[model samples]
Target: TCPFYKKIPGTGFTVDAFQYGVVEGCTAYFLTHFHSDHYAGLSKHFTFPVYCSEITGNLLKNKLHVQEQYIHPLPLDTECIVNGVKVVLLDANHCPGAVMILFYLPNGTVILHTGDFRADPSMERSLLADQKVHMLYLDTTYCSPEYTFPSQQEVIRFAINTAFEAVTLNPHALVVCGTYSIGKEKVFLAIADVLGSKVGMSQEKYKTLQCLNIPEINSLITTDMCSSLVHLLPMMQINFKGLQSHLKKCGGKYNQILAFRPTGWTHSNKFTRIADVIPQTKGNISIYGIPYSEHSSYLEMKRFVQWLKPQKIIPTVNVGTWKSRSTMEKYFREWKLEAGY
Candidate 1:
C-alpha cells in the first residue's frame, strides 16, 4: 500500500503513501492512524509535513520519534482548511487516535479515507450521512462473505464472559490477553473492569500506554508480573508452548494460563456466532482466538458501503486474494445496485 500512490483526485495530497520517497504533486501528507502497517514508510530521516488526529500526532512522536514541526494535529470532527483543501477528522472507532480522513478537494470532490476502522454506529453521526462521497478508501481487512463475524461489543462481552468462566472454575488461574503494540485494549480493559482486576503489562508497553494519556488507564496498568492475574503480551508469543514457558517464568504465581488471542482473523463466518466457538487447551494452558476486531466485519462493511454509496471504492489493504480489489469491486457493485444510489 505504500508504493501505490493514494493520491486524492483533483488535489496535490497523498494519504498514507509515505514510502519516504518524495513524489511529484505531493503537497501534503495525511495519515489516518498510527498502525505500523499503515505508516510503513515513515522514518526519522523522512521529512514531510504530516496531518493527522492529535492522538495520532502524539503516537508518531513517541512511536517513531518524528519531529514535532512536521506533525500537524487536527481536532476530530472539525473542519479546517489546509492549502485550500477542506479537511475533517472522523472518529474511526478502531483504536486510540485512529480516524477516517475526510478530504474535500478544491474542486468540491469528496474523498473519505478510512485507514482502519470498526464501522460502528457512531460513524454515521460523524459522517453527516456521507451526503456526497465521491470516493471511499475503505479498510477491507475482512471484506469477504466468510469474514463476517460478531460486533466488537459482542466479542468484548464474549471474551469477558469466557474469561470469567475460566477464572470462576479456578481463581488461581491467570488470564492473559494477546495483542499487538496497539489495539485490542478494549478486550482486556473489559475483562479487567468486569472481573475487578488490574492489567499487567511490560514496562515498555506501559510507556506506550502512558503516551496515549488516557487517565482511566493509568490506575489500571501494573508493570509487575505478579501484581495482576490479567497480563497483556504479544499475540505471536501466546501459543501453548510459549505460554508454558511464560508460566515457568512466573514461578508458581498462576496455576493455569488462560489466554485469549483477540482477533477477527482467528474467528470467521463459520463459527462467528458467540457460543459455537471453542477454546483450545493443552495441559495447563488454553488460548481463545476471539473475533474481537477493530476493523469492520464483512456484514458491517456491506452496511457501510451501502450507507455511503460512493461513486468509487478503493480498498486500503493491498494483500489477500479472497478480498482482492477486483473481488471488492464486485461486492461494491452488488451493494451499489441492491441498496444505495
Candidate 2:
C-alpha cells in the first residue's frame, strides 16, 4: 500500500475506501496492524489522525517510515471516546503490532473487527470475552474445519533442526530458507538464533530484521552481505525456474538450500502452479517442510467464531461471493450461511 490514497500493491485497485479526510461524515478510522493488507491505504489517505496501539505506531515510525505525529498511538485495550464513538484496541497475536479493534458507535452498535488473528492460549480469555458484540467482522481466511496449522513453536523447532542437519550434513553449503513476508520475521529470527555464526539471511530479509527488536541471540551471524545468500524472494519476483536456478548455483557453491514453506505456498492457484515447477534440489539442497502460516486455518476460524457466538458475522475485505470469504459452504453445504450485518 502507498503512503495515502494509493492502491494496494499488485491489486491494481484500492483495497478499501481511503479515509483521507475526503468524506466529511466519516467519524474516524483505525489501523489493525503493520501489515500491508491492513494499512496499505494509511500513508496517503490517512492525513487525518488514525488510532492504533503505541507499539504499532512506534514500530511503524521507526521501521516502516511512518511519521510519528501523523499517528495517534494509544495503549492497547484502553477505551477512548473519540467523536462520540467508544473504541478499544485489543492485542491480536498475529504480528508484532497487530491488534483487533472493538468499536461502539453512537447508534448503539458494537462492532468487533478481528483483523488477521490466530487462537493462542494467551488470547483465549480476551477473545472469548466478547459479551457485547452485536456485529462481528470476523477474519475468515480459514473458516473451515479442515484447515490446520502447526504450532509456531513446532515450526521453528523443525526449521532449526532441519537447518542444523543441513549444515552438519554439508558444512560447505550456503543455506537458503523461505517464508512469508510479515509473519516470517520470527521464523527468520529463529533461524538466526538456531544457526548463529553458521547461518545468514538474504539482503532483503536482513533489511527487514534490522528494524525489528525481537531479541539478541548467540546464533546470529555478523555477515550482512546478501548479494550471495540464497534467500526466498517474493513469490511475484521469481518463478519456480528462477528459484531452482538460484538454488542450483548457490547450493553448489555453498552448503545447502534450506527453503521453507508448506507443500505448496500461497493461497492463489496461479502461484501453486509455479510451486509445481519448483525443482526438488539434490542432497545439497535441503527442503525443510515447515508450516508457518499467518492467517488462521478454516477450522481455527470456525472454532473461534463459534466460541465468540456473535449475533451477526460480516466478512470485510471480501470480494466476489460469500464463498470467496471462506469455505463456509464447503464445511456446511447443507446449511448455507448468510452474509450481512
Candidate 3:
C-alpha cells in the first residue's frame, strides 16, 4: 500500500507516516521500526505524538534525536490503552526491536499491522492467536510463490560454514557482510561467534549497533578495520568495485574477499537447501547473496494468513499498481473465501 494504507479506517492515527505528516483526522503517529523508509520524515521538529517499542524509541532519541516528550515507549505483550484504543506490541522476529502491532478498536474490530515480519511458528502462541483479526495489514514484499527461501537459522548456518571454508584457506581473509541499519545483526554475529573472529564497521554503524544494546555483540564489533577481518558495510558499499577497492586499501592485510549480502530478493525457488544457493565468484572476490530475509516468504505468509483468517487482507508493501493489485487480491480472495467463510 501507499500512504493511504497508513490511515486506519476507524482510528484517528497513522502507522509509520511521519513523511505524510498531518493526515486529516489523524491524532497520533505509530512507528513500526527505525528503518529509514518508515521513519524518514521524523525530526526534532516533528509535530505529532509518537508511539513505538522501547528499543525503537531509544534509537529514535539517540540516532534521530526526536523530541523525548512526544515519544511513548510501550512494553511488549502487555495491553495498553492509548488514544482510547487497546494496543499490544508483539516481537516481530524481524529485527531486534521490530514489532507487530495489534489494535483492538472500541467497536469489536481487531487490526493486525505486521510491520515487516518474518512469520515465526511461535506466533500462534502469542496474544495475536486469540484475536480474530478484522483486517490484516501485512508486509507482502514477497507475496508470490516464487519468493520461497530457507529459514533464517538455516541460512545463518550456510554463512557460518562459508566463513569456515574461506578462513580455512587463508586465516587473514576478509569477510564482508552487507547490512541495513537494524536488521541482519544475527547473520554477522553468528559468523563472528562461530569463527571466533571480529566484526568491523564504520563508527556510524557501530554507534547504531550500540543503540541496539545487545550486550553479547558489544564486544565483537569495533571501528578498527584491520583488527577484524570480518567487516560490516551497508548494502550499497558491498558492491564488487567497492569491496575490491577496500581490499586494495587493506595494504595486503587481507588475502581474499568473501562478501555476504543477505536479503530476500536474491533467493530463488529453485534452491531447495541453503547449500544450493550458489555463490557468484569472480577470481579471489566471492559474493554470496544469502536469502536470510527478515520479511515473510509466500509460503510463510500463506500459512500465517490462513491461520489468522482475517476478514480482509491489506497489502502494505506493493499496492500502487493494478497488476500488483490483481495478483495480491487474488491470493487473499482465494484465502478469505476458503477459510474465513
Candidate 4:
C-alpha cells in the first residue's frame, strides 16, 4: 500500500494521514478529508491530536467515533500556526469539508498538498495565481490522459435530471441511487431537492447527514419505502439481487427498481467532454451510471499543474505502471523545459 504521510524537511512535522507507527516523535497530524482511504487507520481510540476542518471533525466524532478533544477543527482559508509553521486550508471541492493544505515555511518556501480536489475556476484564480509554490504534493488519481471528464456540477445536473426522468417515466418503480457513505451526499440531496421529496437512507447514513444539520436532509427517513421516493444506498451494497431482496422484504410493494450509479467510470470509454448517461437493464434492474466525480481528470490535472507552475511536483500516491509514470515524467519535463528552469 502507498504511504499516506510525508515529512516536510526543516518543518519537523508531517501533513495528511501517514503511517504513525513508522514515524517517531511526530505527534501533530493534519487531515485533508474524511474519506476512508485518507483516513485509513484513524479510529475512535486514537491518541494523537488531529487537525482538520470543522465538518470533518464532526464526521470524525459522529461517524468514526474520534474523541472531540483530540480532533481540532480549523477554519478554512484562515492562517494558523502549527508547530511554529504557518498553514492555511482551502476548499478541495472533492467532498464536504475536504481541503488543500498550504504550508508557509520560515525559509520562504511554500508547499501545497491538494488532497483530492477537482479543478474549480475560482480556486485557481484565488489560490494558485502568483503564489510561487515551491513543492506541490498532487492527487494523481486520474493522471492518465485517457481519463477525461466534465466538471462535477455538470455531472450532478445530469444525475439529478436522469433520476427525475426515470421517476417520471416509471411512476410505479422505486428509484435507488448508489453513493459512498459520505462522498456523494450532494447527489442524493440534489435529486431530492429537484423532485420535491425526501430521500430514504440507512440508519448510519441518516445519522451522519443529521450531524451536518441541513434542513432539507432532516426530511430523510429510515422507513416508508411504500412512498416510492428516491432512496440513497451504499454503492457497495447495491446490486440486482440486493435490490430485489430489499423490495421483496418491503412486501414487493413496487413494480420495479431503477438504480443510478453516478461515477466518472461511466465515461472511461471515450473523450466525453459532456456528461453522458448510460443505461443498463440486463439484470431486471434499470440502472444509469453517470460520470460524476470530485477528482480532476487527466487534462484538468495537467492544466492545473501548468497553471500552478510549481518548482517541484511530488505525486502523493504511488506512481503505478511504466506508462503512467512515463507520461507524468514527460509532463514534468515539458513544464520545466518550458520555463527553462
> Evaluated with lDDT, which candidate comes out highest?
3
Alpha carbon lDDT of each predicted model = 0.80, 0.56, 0.84, 0.74
Candidate 3's TM-score? 0.94
lDDT of 2 at 149: 58
lDDT of 1 at 16: 80
Q: Give TM per candidate.
A: 0.92, 0.73, 0.94, 0.90
Candidate 4 lDDT over residue span 1-341, tens digit each = 32433666667566665444535656577788878777878888888888888888889899889888898888877889987888888988888888998889899999988888886657777655657899898888877667766666777777778777876887666778887746767777787777777788777777777666455454654545555377877787577777777677666567777787877654454854444445677555777667777788777776778778788888875465678777777877876777565
Tens-digit lDDT string for candidate 1 (85-194):
88888888888888888888777778888888888766776655756889888888887887766767677778888888888999889998887757778888889877
Candidate 3 residue lDDT tens string, 1-341: 23668887788978988776567887878999889888878988876789999889889898888989989999999999988999999999888789889998888888999998998779989998675888889999988888877878788888889898879878878888998768878888888877777798899888888878687766788998878878888798887788888889899888788898887765365655677777778778888887777888888888888898787788898887899989998888887777865
How well does candidate 1 score on lDDT at residue 82? Answer: 86
Ranking by lDDT: 3, 1, 4, 2
Shift in Å, residue 17, candidate 4: 2.9
Predicted candidate 2 versus true structure: per-residue lDDT over 181-240, tens digit per residue: 556666655665555543354555555555544556323533443433335455442334
What's the count of clashing pairs in each model shown?
0, 19, 1, 1
Name model 4 segments beyond 4 Å from true: 1-5, 213-216, 220-228, 266-268, 271-276, 320-323, 338-341
The candidate scoring highest on TM-score is 3
Q: In model 1, which range of ten residues has the least summed lDDT?
A: 263-272
Which has the better TM-score: candidate 2, or candidate 3? Answer: 3
Candidate 3 wrong stretches, greater than 4 Å: 271-273
Rank candidates, TM-score, best first.
3, 1, 4, 2
